[PDB]
Design a protein around this motif. Structure first.
Motif, PDB file in Angstrom:
ATOM      1  N   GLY A 186     -10.364  46.528  -1.133  1.00  0.00           N
ATOM      2  CA  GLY A 186      -9.410  46.794  -0.071  1.00  0.00           C
ATOM      3  C   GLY A 186     -10.045  46.552   1.327  1.00  0.00           C
ATOM      4  N   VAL A 222      -5.722  46.299   9.454  1.00  0.00           N
ATOM      5  CA  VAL A 222      -7.091  46.492   8.891  1.00  0.00           C
ATOM      6  C   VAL A 222      -6.965  47.477   7.806  1.00  0.00           C
ATOM      7  CG1 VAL A 222      -9.452  47.268   9.377  1.00  0.00           C
ATOM      8  CG2 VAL A 222      -8.183  46.111  11.129  1.00  0.00           C
ATOM      9  N   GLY A 223      -7.761  47.179   6.709  1.00  0.00           N
ATOM     10  CA  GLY A 223      -7.957  48.143   5.639  1.00  0.00           C
ATOM     11  C   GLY A 223      -9.459  48.358   5.470  1.00  0.00           C
ATOM     12  N   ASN A 274     -11.037  52.950   0.293  1.00  0.00           N
ATOM     13  CA  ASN A 274     -11.187  54.387   0.018  1.00  0.00           C
ATOM     14  C   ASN A 274     -12.501  54.838   0.592  1.00  0.00           C
ATOM     15  OD1 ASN A 274     -11.828  56.963  -1.274  1.00  0.00           O
ATOM     16  ND2 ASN A 274      -9.653  56.771  -1.470  1.00  0.00           N
ATOM     17  N   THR A 300      -7.845  56.639   2.010  1.00  0.00           N
ATOM     18  CA  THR A 300      -7.737  55.213   2.260  1.00  0.00           C
ATOM     19  C   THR A 300      -7.488  55.100   3.797  1.00  0.00           C
ATOM     20  OG1 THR A 300      -7.065  54.749   0.034  1.00  0.00           O
ATOM     21  CG2 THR A 300      -6.459  53.075   1.722  1.00  0.00           C
ATOM     22  N   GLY A 356      -6.991  52.832   7.383  1.00  0.00           N
ATOM     23  CA  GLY A 356      -6.520  51.525   7.829  1.00  0.00           C
ATOM     24  C   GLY A 356      -5.840  51.562   9.218  1.00  0.00           C
ATOM     25  N   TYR A 357      -5.285  50.480   9.599  1.00  0.00           N
ATOM     26  CA  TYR A 357      -4.604  50.259  10.885  1.00  0.00           C
ATOM     27  C   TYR A 357      -3.513  49.324  10.611  1.00  0.00           C
ATOM     28  CZ  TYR A 357      -3.433  48.315  15.431  1.00  0.00           C
ATOM     29  OH  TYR A 357      -2.762  47.859  16.537  1.00  0.00           O
ATOM     30  N   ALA A 369      -3.061  44.837   5.449  1.00  0.00           N
ATOM     31  CA  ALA A 369      -4.375  45.210   4.910  1.00  0.00           C
ATOM     32  C   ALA A 369      -4.458  46.654   4.667  1.00  0.00           C
ATOM     33  CB  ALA A 369      -5.477  44.705   5.821  1.00  0.00           C
ATOM     34  N   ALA A 370      -3.748  47.547   5.366  1.00  0.00           N
ATOM     35  CA  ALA A 370      -3.992  48.990   5.230  1.00  0.00           C
ATOM     36  C   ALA A 370      -3.764  49.473   3.791  1.00  0.00           C
ATOM     37  CB  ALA A 370      -3.162  49.778   6.235  1.00  0.00           C
ATOM     38  N   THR A 371      -2.877  48.809   3.067  1.00  0.00           N
ATOM     39  CA  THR A 371      -2.484  49.276   1.717  1.00  0.00           C
ATOM     40  C   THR A 371      -3.581  49.072   0.701  1.00  0.00           C
ATOM     41  OG1 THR A 371      -1.475  47.221   1.016  1.00  0.00           O
ATOM     42  CG2 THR A 371      -0.083  48.842   2.160  1.00  0.00           C
ATOM     43  N   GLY A 372      -4.417  48.035   0.900  1.00  0.00           N
ATOM     44  CA  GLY A 372      -5.359  47.595  -0.095  1.00  0.00           C
ATOM     45  C   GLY A 372      -4.702  46.876  -1.263  1.00  0.00           C
ATOM     46  N   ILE A 373      -3.431  46.530  -1.171  1.00  0.00           N
ATOM     47  CA  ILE A 373      -2.723  45.840  -2.267  1.00  0.00           C
ATOM     48  C   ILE A 373      -2.778  44.363  -1.991  1.00  0.00           C
ATOM     49  CG2 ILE A 373      -0.656  45.555  -3.645  1.00  0.00           C
ATOM     50  CD1 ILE A 373       0.058  48.449  -2.632  1.00  0.00           C
ATOM     51  N   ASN A 376      -5.317  53.002  -3.769  1.00  0.00           N
ATOM     52  CA  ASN A 376      -5.574  54.362  -4.246  1.00  0.00           C
ATOM     53  C   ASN A 376      -4.394  54.774  -5.118  1.00  0.00           C
ATOM     54  OD1 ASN A 376      -5.403  57.611  -2.902  1.00  0.00           O
ATOM     55  ND2 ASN A 376      -6.911  56.879  -4.398  1.00  0.00           N
ATOM     56  N   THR A 425      -9.396  54.201  -6.794  1.00  0.00           N
ATOM     57  CA  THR A 425      -9.123  52.825  -6.372  1.00  0.00           C
ATOM     58  C   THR A 425      -9.093  51.974  -7.660  1.00  0.00           C
ATOM     59  OG1 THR A 425     -10.095  53.036  -4.154  1.00  0.00           O
ATOM     60  CG2 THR A 425      -9.761  50.869  -4.997  1.00  0.00           C
TER      61      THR A 425
END
Lengths: 118, 111
Positions: free
Chosen positions: A36, A52-53, A56, A61, A63-64, B32-36, B55, B60
């Motif tokens: 991520g 932004v990510g 974890n 988690t 991010g922005y 990007a915030a999701t991580g998906i 998550n 994760t």
């Protein structure tokens, strides 16, 4: 090689940067989709941060996302070399409390593949 | 877009952005915030390089090709991708997944 700092702590990055693009967007992934860690910028000059990510971070988690008003981010561009700094935010899913906020810096140089795709 | 994990739809509401370079396609859902995200080759069928699911109930979850852990395959029909497999994570969790997304014409232009 890629540099990631979260709350003033160097992250020990063992992986690679992958940079991809299409009209409007430059995706910078550090460590592969499973981490991520990624940033999304406009393809403009000067660049704008879209999101932004940080993945974890201790169970949260972080991010922005541009336009939510939460967290903040700034970028610079020198060709293929980008630097993004700011504050990322998140909420503990298991035990939702106040938002967590952490500073970050990301610095990478994309490969010539990104030049060709532009 | 649709993201399913262990038979449960995640109700992703964000945008799909598909970007490319050097023979790789990155599909990001919700920024990007999701991580998906998923990374595929530009082949017929596409080969899956990586998947991030974010998550999920505290861990994760994801997939990286070439390690022997988890599995993933994909199909492409026009702008539409279907990615299915088994994702893993630790604080070992193994969960099925499916991602279905339609990319914009911006990916076709970049390819």
């Amino acid at each position: 090689g890629p540099k990631v700092v979260i709350d003033g702590k160097d992250q020990n990055v063992t992986g690679s940067v992958v940079c991809t693009t299409a009209a409007g967007n430059v995706n910078i992934a550090i460590g592969g989709a499973a981490t991520g860690i990624a940033a999304v910028l406009t393809d403009g000059n000067p660049p704008e941060v879209k999101s932004v990510g940080l993945g974890n971070v201790n169970g949260v988690t972080l991010g922005y996302t541009s336009g939510t008003g939460q967290g903040n981010a700034s970028a610079t561009k020198d060709g293929s070399h980008y630097k993004i700094t700011g504050t990322a935010t998140g909420v503990d899913m298991a035990n939702p409390m106040s938002p967590v906020n952490k500073s970050f810096e990301i610095e990478v140089t994309c490969s010539t593949k990104l030049a060709a795709a532009l």
